[PDB]
Design a protein around this motif. Structure first.
Motif, PDB file in Angstrom:
ATOM      1  N   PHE A  25       0.883  -1.245  -0.133  1.00  0.00           N
ATOM      2  CA  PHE A  25      -0.064   0.019   0.041  1.00  0.00           C
ATOM      3  C   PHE A  25       0.800   1.263   0.169  1.00  0.00           C
ATOM      4  CE2 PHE A  25      -2.235   3.717   1.808  1.00  0.00           C
ATOM      5  CZ  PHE A  25      -3.518   3.443   1.694  1.00  0.00           C
ATOM      6  N   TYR A  26       1.760   1.329   0.885  1.00  0.00           N
ATOM      7  CA  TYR A  26       2.694   2.608   1.025  1.00  0.00           C
ATOM      8  C   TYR A  26       3.441   2.828  -0.424  1.00  0.00           C
ATOM      9  CZ  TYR A  26       6.418   5.639   2.212  1.00  0.00           C
ATOM     10  OH  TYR A  26       7.342   6.733   2.511  1.00  0.00           O
ATOM     11  N   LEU A  80       2.676   1.789  -3.297  1.00  0.00           N
ATOM     12  CA  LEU A  80       1.669   2.172  -4.443  1.00  0.00           C
ATOM     13  C   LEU A  80       0.975   3.519  -4.161  1.00  0.00           C
ATOM     14  CD1 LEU A  80      -0.274  -1.242  -5.008  1.00  0.00           C
ATOM     15  CD2 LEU A  80       1.481  -0.300  -6.231  1.00  0.00           C
ATOM     16  N   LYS A  81       0.872   3.917  -2.966  1.00  0.00           N
ATOM     17  CA  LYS A  81       0.481   5.295  -2.537  1.00  0.00           C
ATOM     18  C   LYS A  81       1.554   6.253  -2.960  1.00  0.00           C
ATOM     19  CE  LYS A  81      -2.358   8.381  -0.807  1.00  0.00           C
ATOM     20  NZ  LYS A  81      -1.519   9.569  -1.333  1.00  0.00           N
ATOM     21  N   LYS A  82       2.913   5.973  -2.615  1.00  0.00           N
ATOM     22  CA  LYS A  82       3.887   6.829  -3.361  1.00  0.00           C
ATOM     23  C   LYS A  82       4.172   6.992  -4.749  1.00  0.00           C
ATOM     24  CE  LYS A  82       5.254   8.626   0.439  1.00  0.00           C
ATOM     25  NZ  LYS A  82       5.145  10.108   1.069  1.00  0.00           N
ATOM     26  N   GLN A 115       1.551   6.726  -6.938  1.00  0.00           N
ATOM     27  CA  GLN A 115       0.419   7.642  -7.526  1.00  0.00           C
ATOM     28  C   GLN A 115       0.510   8.997  -7.242  1.00  0.00           C
ATOM     29  OE1 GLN A 115      -1.729   6.219  -9.484  1.00  0.00           O
ATOM     30  NE2 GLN A 115      -3.329   7.883  -9.710  1.00  0.00           N
ATOM     31  N   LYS A 166       3.100  10.182  -9.712  1.00  0.00           N
ATOM     32  CA  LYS A 166       2.565  10.465 -11.053  1.00  0.00           C
ATOM     33  C   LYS A 166       1.606  11.662 -10.923  1.00  0.00           C
ATOM     34  CE  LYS A 166       0.205   6.654 -12.382  1.00  0.00           C
ATOM     35  NZ  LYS A 166      -0.743   5.568 -12.115  1.00  0.00           N
TER      36      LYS A 166
END
Lengths: 47, 460, 23, 264, 169, 600, 250, 204
Positions: free
Chosen positions: C1-2, C4-6, C8, C11
């Motif tokens: 999660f962390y 993928l959050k970074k 996003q 981006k």
């Protein structure tokens, strides 16, 4: 010591749940064996 | 009254990204506006606006973006959200997951254009479930009876015959007959052979006039699978709460819908939640499952039976976990019974219809039912315990009482649970089988049945 | 999660930089 | 946690202004001199026509009294006196009893734990119900008993363990709790009261003569249907010439009923 | 004994095969009837556009409706070649009503180089100056947009109200 | 006044011309006026999490900021109302629309205007009088049970410039005007308060007086104080309805608030069907409990924010009635459903997961909610105590109390009434497991029991000891059989059976046990433990004698006392007064004393 | 005494500064005024939850259980503000207090606290449920600075040996108890039964103590020997022969 | 990755495929081949195929069901034998385990690299399973037919007097469709049915 140390994975989670059902079954059957033997043993003592 | 204003068509595609076509220069887009795309070769496609920002509109195209072209594609904006062309003439008919018909019949002459998303049924206007639906299956009707307005899943697993159970329920389901029943069979992520089975089994085996059938195939575009429960439930709400019908909604595999939430979430570029599903999966399942119940001032109702392929055989998985929080109970389909060739392989022990006590009894079924089901549960549970004891002690050590419970288990699986796919049993024929099994015990062993019920029904 | 959050977030920062470069 | 300074000082000028409004209601005439002296420090700030802002900044400056634990205790004593005097409104209690009850409350550790507050809340429960309740046997019996309770409280206060005041609380609250259909039990409770109290005339001059007549008529009207003979019903009917509720009327009615129980 | 219990199921099966043909024939008949009403309406529109009086009043509306949806600074109008005089007048009446209601400047041109297909039942297509955005406000388009939305009222009149509709909610 | 929608993505709406907005202010988005809460500001733009379904919201739609965060309209008209978790009146939505659904974007005011209530102004007030936050400027006689104390908002203060005379008013008629710093406030009877802000008080008092439920196991072994925090394992088999209905039909509480945190649709409608039909005795009348409750009911498909706000609405209502000096009680039928709603909010805000997927703040959101319980000195001048008691049910998956919402709740709540499916399967109503259950409030309530019930502290101690000893002795009974125990242990097990069968069980479906007052409860236990002490005394006194006493001798020579002890539960407070029940119980004490004296 | 109170409903971010205000006051009192200060920090668990909240809101990198990756440094900024210093008579003692989540000794809060603070005192439901107050389970406990705080001038010369033998006997008692729960008391030796009797006498006499009962270290060591004397002298394998010869028969 | 079908690619496959042949490490490790786990595996096509079997192989559907029943009983019997030892098993269960070993080792098992097993035609396959399940039915019948009689047939008596039959049954896999005509293989398997029946008539 405290744990089996299979490495954390969805595989290992499923293997541990399968072992828990195996072990809980094994407890219940061997507890039934102990109950039957305990009943016969108490019957023998009375006899 | 209605959308009098003409549709805009845009060639202004500013990009393409996976399933998304990103229009720009759009005049006042709506979120979830449906759009009709035309490829350069003239192929029509459909899509819905997944995101908006000023002049931009991120259309999620239904079919894959193969053939889209930023210079020559055009996109006709409908000005409106998705509406079901709903009517009572959707009974007797087969639709694909978009609501386009596939039974070679015509398009639907809608009685209203209901929004697929519905609205929440007011908690003050719900009323408690109070009369049984016969599913025709003894392992349900005589052990786990479904109250009309109940939500109750069939938890199953990959390889188990839950589609055959769901189809058998659809053929056999009906009111109790102590007329205005109907089925909506929303099928999601169905492989092409299972879709032929649903379509052909309902056509041939005597059912179509009571059922509306939605078939989203496994390879039909994933957002049509998201639409399919909303499309079906919008029809069930029309039938139940405007045509006064008693609807049963069958959802054939909520796990393939849950996989479609995960895909449409990744399309929005949302961060994956618990075990990769969207964080809001609980609200989306509630938005499906709670489109159910009786309501005050109306005779009609919606029952629901969400069939659900538990991943990895594990009820802890978020798909069954969140379902168990919303639904009033569960029915479990078991690989052990299935491998024993017992059809339907419904295991009556871990099954629980949370509302069965308010589906059945005097003036709803026969008045013995609650007692018979409790005692059948006890005799099956005790008989399983005796089969586990016979493994240990050997048959000669069993008491006469244990030998009765072991014979009950053999006969209960071979006569009560075993049924076959085209045998339909009324609740009465199921309770008669229930008695002809319980009648194997001495009258005094039936301890969960009151002496009054025994004096009325134990004498053969 | 962390992770993928970074991703996003990075981006989103690239989009903001592109919108500034289009000035 | 707690209060902002604006809230704290606002609550202080509140309790000062309220102690003054209470003082003007307990004593419109300056009769309660020893009580009024024990609030002179707060009362000046409200007897003078100060603006709310002026008294507020005076509280911030510490010129007004401004401990809320002190003001709550001091205000509670005055309010529990005002609730007493207002809950007995038909009978103005004596000035020496008022200053005596004030002193006893001032000496008590915590009034909400006191049996004073329990007794006073029961008096309010009866009184507030009777301000609204419609004509019926239960409500007539409760009006009568509560008027006697208010009279007795106006002669002994709350802190005195007067056995009459205690019995009026027990019987009044029990009759209030007694289910409405229980007419014979309500009648038996009220009959028990007039029979058991020391006075031959427990209600005489305590309450309006119209209400006394209603109580008499009520007691007679639930006795008459018990008599199997019209001659005895006429002998009983002749008691309706009365108007004061008395033990002698109840005993006469009870004897006429017992004469019918013998004459069967 | 099982085959004897199945006699009621066999009757329901055989009757359902007949009823499935019956239902779909009746529903196909309903759709053919309404489709022919829309065919007659498309013919009636192709008659209405022959009366220059009503057709001017239509074009005065259709052009202004195009412009009011497509709020760009510049518009191009496509029409059938023979309609051009009525369309030019419609644009000339529309430009003032556009400017007055939108409170901004505009330029509107009629496409002398690329007319619409002459066999269309009249009306207009409007495009922005870039030709990247268009609005399909032809009489045929209006009929298919309106007739589809009117289907509940069309059904309720042509085939009667559904007697099962105890509620409208 | 209003901004404009700039972008939309699922529930998240970005709006522009929002320059005057505030963080967590509440907004009506779209022409349909969908409710949404501002989750971020970025200059002249706001990001609004719309609560309701955003499908059909358009760029350039209006975005009307209400000047307020999520807030409860407090006032007359609450009692008997049913609301969703964002404070929309579900009975009025149905009656005004004649639809079975909640329409998207309901505007309906939460306390209905155009209803007129009888208002009495507080007779002491005058023009020029000083007034402070929490002062009662009048009373509204809405119900016979509940008189609504109209009061100044906690932040308001000043000098009264007008007060309305005695009369009939709707919630938006101006009832009071007052001036402070040269500015006038015009006050309605309705009062609007932010739902996530604690309503302030003069003092948060120590909780000391018992919330009698009328249930023997609960009121004796595991008392919850008024102002106490408590939990119940809300699950299928447990019978959670028993405590809920008992509190409704008897409790020592003035007002009851329920919160459905997202119950299953049918289970919610079962509760909403039942409570209009429940009744309690008041001044010898029987009246519907809907005269003294409010229901904050949400099904699982209500907007996520309605489920997460559900407890905050229920506690803000409860604090409002607490500030009237009413001893409020409230229940949440599952705080786990509230924590699922909080998890979903957090997932939509894209925040980091903590334990089991829940947000980091779950522990502080629970603890700040339960901390809003208590007993208090209210604001304003009439020196009134009030309270809120919070009964938040927990739903541990598979019964695993280590689950974060359950474990945090059990870390905060001072009482756990461990309902147990095994007891319900035995029909041992009320089905409270006395081994799992606990209460921390004994140390406070010991003051009340020392004043009013001075024998009870020994009795409670002895009862718990007898039950704990029986749980150990049952292992010896399994190992060597009941006949092999010592006489002291046998009589302990027999009395523990008497306690389990005829004290801890209570037949709430029947008049004698519908409620069980504390005077009955202490009296029953006083006899059972007097029987224990004298029986065990006779055994131990005759140890090593020729004529040794045992339970079998007692059952043979004086078994009438065991029969009477089991019979004592059948006494009914509605038939026989507490003095008569106490006198009969005192006769059983004398009877057993004479019986034991007849043996040793 | 000074109290800093952040109540359960007070804004959660103040928890981060609350123990720092307390320690800043303790540094003034202990270094500027040279007092011996005792600092009590209540539910460092709620402090660590405030760290988890801030990191979740800032999207800082998570360590174990979502706590900040830097949590050890942040706890060290609180816990290292303890101890005596050169030329000052004063001292800052600290007794932090924490609720271990789900009883998990391996949880980041007790783990990082256990890596910073010198020793941990443990209290256990396995004592409290049996009404053993104070519920201090010695076995998982340890005081790192104890080795220096005991023996001549501070305490009796036996103290360092007596402590280690009490740990051996208590621990072997738990180990033979775990064996008994499988194989029963028939398989245990006479010495294993003595380690079980030691465990019972140890929890009843050594741990259990009234809330107002005060025991000196010397009285505690006398009770230590009154328990160690349950075993024969030769069993006491942690104690030197000189210490046994001076104290075992007394 | 782990051999576990809980992986996202197997899970997404199993939601679509109608046939699954779960190759199991426990069978592969004991060198049981082809290692396909008969408890995990499934084929949903049986419904559609019954119209073929009830026309070309009319005996097969009863055999297919009783084969899975035996193999599932063996999964229970094997577990209890591991937990408590085999001495408690009734004679029906001993026979069920014995025929389950015949099926498991001499029908279900197949060697990929030997001319006996390079291809096993369906006429051979049904003929084999027919004989093994005819032995199961007749052996179980022989026990149940002599329970409560003055002399009782047992698995030990069967293991002696049916020994040549058990060897012939295990040998059925060696018939070779290249060297033996289908009619010859079928005729030999018909002779095995007669040989079994006549051998059981010596016990009953």
């Amino acid at each position: 010591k405290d744990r089996i140390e299979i490495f954390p994975s969805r595989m290992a989670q499923t293997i541990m749940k399968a072992r828990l059902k195996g072990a809980q079954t094994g407890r219940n059957l061997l507890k039934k064996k102990s109950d039957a033997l305990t009943l016969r043993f108490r019957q023998i003592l009375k006899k | 009254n209605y959308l009098s204003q003409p549709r805009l068509t845009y060639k202004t595609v500013s990009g393409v990204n996976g399933p998304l076509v990103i229009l720009d220069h759009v005049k006042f887009p709506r979120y979830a506006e449906i759009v009709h795309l035309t490829l350069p070769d003239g192929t029509k496609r459909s899509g819905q606006v997944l995101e908006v920002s000023g002049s931009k509109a991120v259309v999620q195209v239904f079919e894959g973006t193969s053939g889209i072209d930023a210079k020559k594609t055009s996109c006709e904006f409908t000005g409106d959200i998705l509406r079901t062309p709903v009517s009572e003439d959707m009974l007797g008919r087969v639709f694909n997951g978009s609501g386009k018909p596939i039974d070679r019949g015509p398009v639907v002459l809608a009685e209203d254009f209901l929004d697929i998303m519905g609205q929440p049924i007011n908690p003050q206007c719900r009323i408690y479930p109070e009369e049984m639906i016969q599913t025709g299956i003894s392992a349900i009707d005589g052990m786990n009876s479904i109250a009309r307005g109940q939500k109750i899943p069939i938890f199953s697993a990959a390889g188990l015959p839950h589609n055959e159970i769901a189809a058998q329920i659809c053929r056999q389901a009906g009111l109790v007959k102590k007329e205005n029943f109907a089925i909506v069979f929303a099928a999601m992520g169905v492989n092409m052979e299972t879709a032929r089975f649903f379509k052909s089994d309902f056509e041939e085996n005597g059912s179509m006039d009571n059922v509306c059938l939605f078939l989203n195939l496994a390879n039909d575009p994933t957002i049509e699978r998201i639409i399919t429960p909303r499309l079906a439930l919008t029809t069930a709400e029309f039938l139940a709460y405007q045509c006064e019908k008693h609807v049963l909604v069958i959802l054939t595999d909520m796990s393939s819908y849950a996989e479609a939430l995960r895909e449409v979430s990744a399309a929005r570029e949302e961060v994956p939640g618990r075990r990769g599903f969207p964080g809001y999966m609980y609200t989306d399942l509630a938005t499906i499952y709670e489109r159910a119940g009786r309501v005050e001032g109306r005779n009609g109702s919606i029952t629901q039976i969400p069939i659900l392929t538990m991943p990895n055989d594990d009820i802890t998985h978020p798909i069954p976990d969140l379902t168990g929080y919303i639904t009033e109970g569960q029915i479990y389909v078991d690989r052990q019974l299935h491998n024993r060739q017992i059809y339907p392989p419904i295991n009556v022990l871990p099954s629980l219809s949370r509302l069965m006590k308010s589906a059945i009894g005097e003036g709803m079924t026969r008045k013995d039912h609650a007692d018979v089901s409790n005692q059948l549960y006890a005799c099956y549970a005790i008989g399983k315990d005796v089969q586990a004891m016979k493994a240990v002690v050997g048959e000669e050590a069993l008491t006469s009482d244990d030998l009765l419970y072991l014979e009950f288990l053999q006969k209960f699986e071979k006569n009560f649970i075993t049924q076959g796919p085209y045998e339909n049993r009324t609740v009465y024929e199921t309770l008669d089988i229930g008695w002809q099994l319980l009648r194997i015990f001495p009258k005094e062993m039936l301890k969960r049945i009151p002496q009054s019920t025994l004096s009325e029904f134990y004498p053969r | 999660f962390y992770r993928l959050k970074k991703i996003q977030e990075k981006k989103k920062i690239i989009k903001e930089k592109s919108e500034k470069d289009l000035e | 946690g707690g209060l902002t300074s604006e809230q704290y000082h606002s609550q202080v000028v509140g309790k000062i202004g309220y102690i003054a409004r209470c003082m003007q209601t307990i004593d419109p005439e300056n009769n309660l001199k020893k009580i009024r002296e024990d609030y002179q420090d707060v009362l000046i700030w409200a007897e003078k026509n100060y603006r709310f802002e002026e008294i507020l900044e005076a509280s911030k400056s510490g010129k007004c009294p401004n401990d809320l634990d002190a003001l709550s205790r001091r205000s509670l004593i005055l309010q529990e006196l005002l609730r007493l005097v207002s809950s007995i409104s038909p009978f103005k209690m004596k000035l020496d009893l008022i200053e005596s009850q004030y002193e006893k409350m001032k000496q008590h550790v915590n009034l909400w734990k006191s049996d004073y507050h329990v007794k006073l809340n029961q008096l309010n429960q009866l009184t507030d119900y009777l301000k609204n309740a419609a004509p019926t046997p239960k409500n007539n019996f409760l009006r009568a008993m509560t008027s006697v309770l208010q009279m007795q409280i106006a002669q002994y206060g709350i802190t005195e363990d007067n056995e009459g005041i205690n019995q009026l609380f027990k019987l009044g609250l029990h009759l209030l709790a007694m289910a409405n259909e229980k007419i014979d039990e309500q009648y038996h409770l009220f009959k028990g009261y007039v029979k058991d109290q020391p006075e031959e005339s427990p209600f005489e001059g305590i309450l309006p003569a119209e209400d006394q007549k209603i109580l008499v008529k009520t007691m007679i009207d639930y006795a008459m249907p018990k008599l199997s003979s019209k001659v005895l019903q006429d002998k009983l009917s002749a008691l309706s010439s009365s108007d004061v509720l008395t033990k002698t009327l109840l005993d006469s009615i009870d004897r006429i009923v017992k004469e019918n129980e013998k004459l069967n | 004994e099982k085959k004897e219990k199945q006699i009621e199921q066999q009757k329901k099966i055989q009757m359902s095969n007949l009823m499935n043909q019956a239902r779909l024939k009746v529903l196909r008949a309903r759709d053919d009837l309404i489709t022919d009403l829309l065919n007659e309406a498309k013919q009636r529109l192709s008659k209405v556009v022959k009366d220059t009086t009503r057709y001017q009043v239509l074009l005065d509306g259709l052009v202004l409706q195009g412009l009011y949806q497509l709020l760009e600074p510049r518009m191009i109008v496509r029409c059938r070649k023979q309609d051009f005089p009525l369309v030019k007048a419609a644009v000339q009446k529309a430009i003032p009503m556009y400017k007055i209601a939108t409170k901004k400047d505009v330029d509107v041109q009629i496409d002398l180089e690329a007319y619409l297909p002459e066999d269309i039942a009249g009306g207009v297509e409007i495009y922005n100056g870039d030709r990247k955005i268009k609005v399909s406000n032809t009489l045929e388009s209006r009929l298919d947009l309106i007739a589809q939305q009117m289907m509940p009222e069309v059904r309720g009149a042509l085939f009667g109200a559904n007697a099962n509709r105890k509620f409208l909610d | 006044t209003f901004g404009y929608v700039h972008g939309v993505s699922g529930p998240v709406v970005t709006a522009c011309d929002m320059a005057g907005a505030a963080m967590y202010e509440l907004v009506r988005v779209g022409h349909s006026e969908l409710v949404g809460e501002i989750i971020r500001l970025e200059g002249d733009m706001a990001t609004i999490q719309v609560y309701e379904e955003t499908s059909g919201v358009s760029v350039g739609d209006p975005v009307l900021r209400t000047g307020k965060p999520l807030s409860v309209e407090l006032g007359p008209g609450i009692m008997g109302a049913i609301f969703d978790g964002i404070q929309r009146p579900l009975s009025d939505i149905s009656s005004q629309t004649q639809s079975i659904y909640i329409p998207r974007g309901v505007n309906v005011s939460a306390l209905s205007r155009d209803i007129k209530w009888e208002f009495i102004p507080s007779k002491n007030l005058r023009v020029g009088s000083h007034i402070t936050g929490g002062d009662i400027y009048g009373i509204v006689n809405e119900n016979s049970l509940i008189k609504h104390k109209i009061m100044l908002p906690p932040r308001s203060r000043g000098s009264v410039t007008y007060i309305a005379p005695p009369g009939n008013y709707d919630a938006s008629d101006v009832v009071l005007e007052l001036e402070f710093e040269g500015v006038k406030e015009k006050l309605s009877m309705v009062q609007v308060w932010p739902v996530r802000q604690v309503r302030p008080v003069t003092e948060k008092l120590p909780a000391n007086h018992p919330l009698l439920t009328g249930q023997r196991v609960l009121d004796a072994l595991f008392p919850c104080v008024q102002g106490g925090t408590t939990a119940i394992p809300g699950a299928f088999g447990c019978g959670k309805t028993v405590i809920s209905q008992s509190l409704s039909k008897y409790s020592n509480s003035d007002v009851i608030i329920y919160v459905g945190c997202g119950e299953r649709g049918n289970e919610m409608s079962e509760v909403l069907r039942d409570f209009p039909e429940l009744t309690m005795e008041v001044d010898g009348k029987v009246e519907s409990i809907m005269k003294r409750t409010a229901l904050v009911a949400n099904t699982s498909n209500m907007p996520v924010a309605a489920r997460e706000a559900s407890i905050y609405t229920g506690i803000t209502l409860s604090e409002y009635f607490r500030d009237m000096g009413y001893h409020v009680s409230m229940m949440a039928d599952s705080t786990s459903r509230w924590a699922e709603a909080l998890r979903e909010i957090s997932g939509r805000l894209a925040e980091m997961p903590a334990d089991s997927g829940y947000p980091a703040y779950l522990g502080a959101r629970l603890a700040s909610f339960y901390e809003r319980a208590g007993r208090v000195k209210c604001l304003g001048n009439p020196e009134r105590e009030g309270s809120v008691s919070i009964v938040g049910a927990v739903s541990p998956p598979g019964g695993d109390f280590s689950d974060p919402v359950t474990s945090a709740t059990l870390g905060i709540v001072q009482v756990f009434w461990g309902l147990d499916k095994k007891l319900a399967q035995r029909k041992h109503f009320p089905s409270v497991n006395w081994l799992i259950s606990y209460s921390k409030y004994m140390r406070a309530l010991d003051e009340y029991y020392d004043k009013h019930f001075t024998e009870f502290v020994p009795l409670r101690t002895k009862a718990k000891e007898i039950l704990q000893e029986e749980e150990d002795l049952a292992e010896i009974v399994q190992l060597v059989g009941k006949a092999s125990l010592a006489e002291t242990d046998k009589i302990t097990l027999e009395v523990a059976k008497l306690i389990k069968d005829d004290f801890l069980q209570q037949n709430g479906y029947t008049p004698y046990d519908r409620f069980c007052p504390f005077y009955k409860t202490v009296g029953m236990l006083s006899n059972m433990i007097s029987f224990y002490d004298m029986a065990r005394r006779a055994v131990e006194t005759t140890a090593q004698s020729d004529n040794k006493i045992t339970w079998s001798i007692i059952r043979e020579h004086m078994g009438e006392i065991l029969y009477k002890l089991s019979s004592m539960k059948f006494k009914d407070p509605v038939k026989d007064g507490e003095a008569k029940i106490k006198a009969d119980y005192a006769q059983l004490l004398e009877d057993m004393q004479n019986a034991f004296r007849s043996l040793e």
